[PDB]
Paper text:
Bromodomains (BRDs) are protein interaction modules that specifically recognize ε-N-lysine acetylation motifs, a key event in the reading process of epigenetic marks. The 61 BRDs in the human genome cluster into eight families based on structure/sequence similarity. Despite large sequence variations, all BRD modules share a conserved fold that comprises a left-handed bundle of four α helices (αZ, αA, αB, αC), linked by loop regions of variable length (ZA and BC loops), which line the Kac binding site and determine binding specificity. The four helices form a deep cavity that is extended by the two loop regions (ZA and BC loops), creating a largely hydrophobic Kac binding pocket.
Also, WDR9(2) and EP300 exclusively interacted with the triply modified H3 pT3K4acK9ac peptide. The WDR9(2) interaction with H3K14ac showed strong dependence on S10 and T11 phosphorylation as well as acetylation at K18.
Residue numbers in the entry: 1317 to 1423
Amino acid sequence: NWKKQCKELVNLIFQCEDSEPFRQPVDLVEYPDYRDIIDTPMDFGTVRETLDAGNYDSPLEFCKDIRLIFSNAKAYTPNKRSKIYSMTLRLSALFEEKMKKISSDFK
């Protein structure tokens, strides 16, 4: 059951300290130029909601949206000295480790 596996992984991510800036959509009052840089916003709350609505056709679609969270974060704050950049690298690494098993069990 890939859907329950992906749900467990999203719940795991919400418990990770590094996910805090990615739990909700980026706020456009706080970051007014965000959408001049980012075409397709994404966050873990949205991913959770999409999964619960049954609106991912496969784990690859789920993964693509999670990868988008990280690519967006790195695009908007590209300075590798920044806290957010390091939090993105660490959380990305954990996610990819976990997603590997889900993707195998599927294929």
